[PDB]
């Protein structure tokens, strides 16, 4: 819509207060004109029609329970935009300031979130195993990162390229989580998963085996479930990324940590310059090694740590 | 689980099923939904 750029206030899924950028024209809309061509958040109203209605509020106060998923979808989309802009000089997911659209209250009892090629969508969860998924900044950034990947490498969502696609989303989801710097960790989706279990998550990057995901190439899943294991084999890459940043010893192989910023720089360059739709795990290794070489030089700690991390997870 | 209504099965898989009404735009193997 066209109106006056305003700042509203509300409460997110986890009960935290935050300010949100809105647009006033008769109603206050969840339309943030401060970032690129806009961040727009919609109500799917328990149905599956997308995008649904641009979120309209009478008073610019978003403190109702029903408002909470919208507050967080809108806010966290903004954080993710800022991350790509400020850290990687990338303007929205297409690098050309594409509008970022998100819909909440998708369907009923819907235990997932997605990118559909055009927008982000968040279920509310069944309330027992998930709460509304936009409550997790890592989850939001993971979905928008799928859009980034689409527009850059085009990693086909199947088999190894698809697991790389997934790991890229978990890597940058996590780096956006750290960038916001509230309660960051190397777990995925902890803030919206099993509200009656503390300490767990959907996936772990630090220890993928905690939830049955492989942490070494020798344990890769080669069947057909989950698009050839895209959310399973991502563990192998996630563990490599974790080791690159944090260091550690994994099946007896030590890796020197080079930190999150250098991890993000190496992987962003890999994704935008060296990966293609058919890239496999060995090709991702080559891409990350070449990226680190471009950025830091062949003799660098950074190059060596990328090699050691991929060795530690059995990717040659 | 169970999925015993006939010609169906359980999996933790992709977002799209085969639905008569939607086959023209999406199906199990041509699914635009990326989780």
């Amino acid at each position: 819509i066209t109106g006056t750029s305003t700042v509203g206030v509300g409460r997110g899924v986890l009960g935290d207060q935050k300010n949100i950028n809105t647009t006033y024209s008769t109603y206050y809309y969840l339309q943030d004109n401060t970032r690129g061509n806009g961040i727009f958040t919609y109500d799917a109203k328990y149905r599956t029609t997308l995008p649904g209605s641009l979120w309209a509020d009478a008073d610019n106060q978003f403190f109702a329970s029903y408002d909470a998923p919208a507050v967080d979808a809108h806010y966290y989309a903004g954080v993710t935009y800022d991350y790509y802009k400020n850290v990687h000089n990338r303007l929205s997911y297409d690098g050309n300031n594409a509008a970022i659209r998100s819909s909440v209250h998708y369907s009923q009892g819907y235990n997932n979130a997605f990118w559909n090629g055009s927008q982000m969508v968040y279920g509310d969860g069944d309330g027992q195993t998930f709460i509304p998924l936009s409550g997790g900044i890592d989850v939001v950034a993971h979905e928008l990162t799928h859009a980034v990947t689409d527009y850059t490498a085009g990693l086909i969502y199947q088999n190894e390229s698809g697991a790389i696609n997934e790991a890229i989303s978990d890597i940058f989801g996590t780096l956006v989580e750290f960038y916001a710097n509230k309660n960051p960790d190397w777990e995925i989706g902890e803030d919206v998963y099993t509200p009656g279990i503390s300490g767990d998550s959907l996936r772990s990057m630090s220890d993928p085996a905690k939830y049955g995901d492989p942490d070494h190439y020798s344990k890769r899943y080669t069947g057909t479930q989950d698009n050839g294991g895209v959310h399973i084999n991502s563990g192998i890459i996630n563990k490599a990324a974790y080791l690159i940043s944090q260091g550690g010893t994994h099946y007896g192989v030590s890796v020197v940590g080079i930190g999150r910023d250098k991890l993000g720089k190496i992987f962003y360059r890999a994704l935008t310059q060296y990966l293609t739709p058919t890239s496999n795990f060995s090709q991702l290794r080559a891409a990350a090694v070449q990226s680190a070489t471009d950025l830091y030089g062949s003799t660098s700690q950074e190059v060596a740590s990328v090699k050691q991390a991929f060795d530690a997870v059995g990717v040659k | 689980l169970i999925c015993n209504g006939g010609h169906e099965y359980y999996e933790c898989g992709g977002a799209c099923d085969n639905v008569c009404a939607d086959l023209h735009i999406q199906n199990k193997t041509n699914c635009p939904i990326i989780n």
Binding site: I188, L202, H231 | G5, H7, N35
Partner: peptide, 30 residues
């Protein structure tokens, strides 16, 4: 963010209005 715990129709089959998986050859126009 993760896989979907779902019932799927077998290849060759698709959900009718009733939600039953039937042969795709028995689907209607739309």
């Amino acid at each position: 963010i993760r896989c979907n715990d779902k019932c799927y129709c077998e290849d060759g089959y698709a959900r009718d209005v009733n939600g039953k998986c039937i042969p795709i050859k028995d689907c209607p126009k739309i």
